Amino acid sequence: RKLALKTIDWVAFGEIIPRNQKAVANSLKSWNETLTSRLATLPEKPPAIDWAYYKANVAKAGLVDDFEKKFNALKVPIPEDKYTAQVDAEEKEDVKSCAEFLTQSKTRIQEYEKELEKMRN
Amino acid sequence: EVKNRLDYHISVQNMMRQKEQEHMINWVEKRVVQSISAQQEKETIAKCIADLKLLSKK
């Protein structure tokens, strides 16, 4: 693991015209920050083991080898995705925003500015 | 988590040698400390070296 990245956007937070999440985003960013700091903290890697020399200094040297093989050959799986609708249940609710609220909002605007012109006249 | 049990086995065998070292030693030394004493000639070597002091210091 390894995971990529989007910066704070406070404008975003407030707006969520899916009302059922309005609070959540404020809290959810702060949950994020928990991860953000936590990841920035740690490195990815320990070292490894020179089993040859440790076998020299372990008289039960079989052990070093056995655990060596199992460990070094082993790879444990990255904590696995369960959710990826985020992108989606957004970008669709972002259309929800645009088309649905874009159109209605832009069409309203036009009438306003249309009467003003003649009101400047 | 891996390392410490490996190091434990070594560390115990190390600790287990020293103790065996003192106890071994104690029997070997507590046996033969006694026998040596027949050598008059280490007091032969005391005088001898003692002359190589008494003469050879000044």
Swiss-Prot record, chain A:
Localization annotation: Mitochondrion; Mitochondrion inner membrane
Molecular function via GO: proton-transporting ATP synthase activity, rotational mechanism
Domain of life: Eukaryota
N6-acetyllysine, modified sites: 29, 45, 60, 69, 75, 82, 92, 114
GO terms for biological process, alphabetical: proton motive force-driven ATP synthesis; proton motive force-driven mitochondrial ATP synthesis
Entry-annotated residues carrying N6-succinyllysine: 75, 82, 92
Keywords noted in UniProt: Acetylation, CF(0), Hydrogen ion transport, Ion transport, Membrane, Mitochondrion, Mitochondrion inner membrane, Transport
Chain's role: Subunit d, of the mitochondrial membrane ATP synthase complex (F(1)F(0) ATP synthase or Complex V) that produces ATP from ADP in the presence of a proton gradient across the membrane which is generated by electron transport complexes of the respiratory chain. ATP synthase complex consist of a soluble F(1) head domain - the catalytic core - and a membrane F(1) domain - the membrane proton channel. These two domains are linked by a central stalk rotating inside the F(1) region and a stationary peripheral stalk.
Sequence similarity: Belongs to the ATPase d subunit family.
Subunit structure: Component of the ATP synthase complex composed at least of ATP5F1A/subunit alpha, ATP5F1B/subunit beta, ATP5MC1/subunit c (homooctomer), MT-ATP6/subunit a, MT-ATP8/subunit 8, ATP5ME/subunit e, ATP5MF/subunit f, ATP5MG/subunit g, ATP5MK/subunit k, ATP5MJ/subunit j, ATP5F1C/subunit gamma, ATP5F1D/subunit delta, ATP5F1E/subunit epsilon, ATP5PF/subunit F6, ATP5PB/subunit b, ATP5PD/subunit d, ATP5PO/subunit OSCP.
Name of the protein in its database record: ATP synthase peripheral stalk subunit d, mitochondrial
Species of the source: Bos taurus
Residues shown, of full length: 4 to 124 of 161
From Swiss-Prot, chain B:
Superkingdom, natural source: Eukaryota
Modified residues (N6-acetyllysine): 30, 42, 53
Localization of this protein: Mitochondrion; Mitochondrion inner membrane
Family, per entry: Belongs to the eukaryotic ATPase B chain family.
Function text: Subunit b, of the mitochondrial membrane ATP synthase complex (F(1)F(0) ATP synthase or Complex V) that produces ATP from ADP in the presence of a proton gradient across the membrane which is generated by electron transport complexes of the respiratory chain. ATP synthase complex consist of a soluble F(1) head domain - the catalytic core - and a membrane F(1) domain - the membrane proton channel. These two domains are linked by a central stalk rotating inside the F(1) region and a stationary peripheral stalk.
Subunit structure: Component of the ATP synthase complex composed at least of ATP5F1A/subunit alpha, ATP5F1B/subunit beta, ATP5MC1/subunit c (homooctomer), MT-ATP6/subunit a, MT-ATP8/subunit 8, ATP5ME/subunit e, ATP5MF/subunit f, ATP5MG/subunit g, ATP5MK/subunit k, ATP5MJ/subunit j, ATP5F1C/subunit gamma, ATP5F1D/subunit delta, ATP5F1E/subunit epsilon, ATP5PF/subunit F6, ATP5PB/subunit b, ATP5PD/subunit d, ATP5PO/subunit OSCP.
Protein name: ATP synthase peripheral stalk subunit b, mitochondrial
Full protein: residues contained: 192 to 249 of 256
